Amino acid sequence: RSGILVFDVNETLLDLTSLSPLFERVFGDAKVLREWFPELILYSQTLTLTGLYRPFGEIAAAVFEMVAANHQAKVTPDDIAELKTRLTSMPAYPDVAPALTRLQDAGFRLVTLTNSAPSPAPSPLEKAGIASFFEAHLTVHSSQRFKPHPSVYDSTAETLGAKPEELCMIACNIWDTIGAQARGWRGGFVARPHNTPLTLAEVPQPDFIGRDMGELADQLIASLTA
Amino acid sequence: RSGILVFDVNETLLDLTSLSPLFERVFGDAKVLREWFPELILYSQTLTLTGLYRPFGEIAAAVFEMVAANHQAKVTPDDIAELKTRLTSMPAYPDVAPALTRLQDAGFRLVTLTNSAPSPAPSPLEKAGIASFFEAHLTVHSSQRFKPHPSVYDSTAETLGAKPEELCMIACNIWDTIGAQARGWRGGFVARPHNTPLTLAEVPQPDFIGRDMGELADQLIASLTA
Secondary structure, eight states: OOOEEEEOOBTTTBOGGGGHHHHHHHHSOGGGHHHHHHHHHHHHHHHHHTTOOOOHHHHHHHHHHHHHHHHTOOOOHHHHHHHHHHHTOOOBOTTHHHHHHHHHHTTOEEEEEESSOOOOSSOHHHHHTOGGGOSEEEESTTTTSOTTOHHHHHHHHHHTTOOGGGEEEEESOHHHHHHHHTTTOEEEEEOOTTOOOOOOTTSOOOSEEESSHHHHHHHHHHHHHO | OOOEEEEOOBTTTBOGGGGHHHHHHHHSOGGGHHHHHHHHHHHHHHHHHHTOOOOHHHHHHHHHHHHHHHTTOOOOHHHHHHHHHHHTOOOBOTTHHHHHHHHHHTTOEEEEEESSOOOSSSOHHHHTTOGGGOSEEEEGGGTTOOTTOHHHHHHHHHHHTOOGGGEEEEESSHHHHHHHHHTTOEEEEEOBTTBOOOOOTTSOOOSEEESSHHHHHHHHHHTTTO
C-alpha cells in the first residue's frame, strides 16, 4: 500500500555490539570491534570491485584473522567458531519489533536485504524473533556482489516487482542508503550507537532520519499524512 | 629494464602513524586512527561503486567528523586543517630509501600510484625526500574512481605504455594488490606494523611477500635470475 520498506539486517535491526565480549577477550579491548567491522565492509566492496565473490561470513573470518595478526593476538579454531555463533545470532534492538508492528499497521510492506549469505533455518532474524514481520528475506546471493553495488538494489527491485520510486532502504550505514538512493530508491537512516551519518558534498543525504527505529517509523508514517 | 614497480604511497612508503598525536588529542586515544582509516577506505570504495567522486582528503575530513561524532568528540576547524597538514606530510619509513636504491640499482623502473589527489609541489613524496627515485607519479584523480577499481590500474598501464605482465603493484594492503592482480599485474605485499596480509580461499596470493621493504626487495631482486 504505502510503499516497500527494505531493511538492512546486521547492525540496523540486530545489535553488532553483542560481539564486544569476543573482542574484549581476544584483543583485551572491545573497541577492536570498530576496527574489524569497517575492514570487513571494505574487503567485501574490494572483492566486488575486483570481480570476486566469497560469502560474507568467510570474509568476516578472514578479516578477524588479519586484525588478530595486526594486533599479534592469538586466535584459535574455537574463536572462529564463536565469531560465527555471535555474528549469526545478534539480538534485535528492543525498539525494532514495536516499530515494525506500527509500520505494518500503517500499511507498509516490509522486506529485508543483507550482505549475509542465505542461511539454513533458523536464520539470525528467526533467532532474534523478528523474521515473521517481513514478507521476503533477500540477500546479495543472486547478485554475487556486495552492497553498495548497483546490481544488488536493481535485482532486489526486480524480485519485488517494484519501481525504484516504491522502495525505501533503511539502514544505520550511510554507505547502504547511498547505494539505494543512487538507484532512485528513497533512503531512511536510523542512528544507532556509534553510527552517525556521513556528510559530504555531492553525496545524497537520507530522505528520512531518526535517532532510533521508533522515531524513524514515526516520520515514515507521518509522511503519509503530510 | 627489469619490470616496472608501482608503489602505493600512503601507509606503504609514508608512515600513517605520524597522525597518532592528532587522534590522541581529539579522541583521547591514538588507536582511533585504526578505526578512522578503514572507514575512509570503505567510503572511497563506496563512492566508486555508486558513481560518485570527491578528492580523497575531502572524504578523509568527512570521515574524521563522522568518527568524531560517533565518539561524541568535539572537532574544530583547527583539527580539520591539522588533519590535512598531517595527511599531506607523512614521513618515509626508514627502510624505504635503502630498498628503492637497491631496486633501482638492480634495474627496476619505479612509479607511484596513490588515492590522494595531486597537490602543488612539493608533493608528500617530495617533502619526505624520496620523490627522486620515481620516474612517474600517478593518482586516481583523472579516473575519478578509487582503488581497487579496474579503471585505475588500466589507465596507469596505459599512461606508462606498459603491459600488465611488465607491472608489479607494491602495497601493505591486500586490497590494493588484489586490484592490480585482477588486471594481470603481479603483486608484492610489504608488511608494515599493524598491516599484515589478508588470506582468503580463492583470492590470488601476492607474488612476492616481505616482512619489510628490504625483504620484499630481496625477493624482487631474486626473481630476476631464479
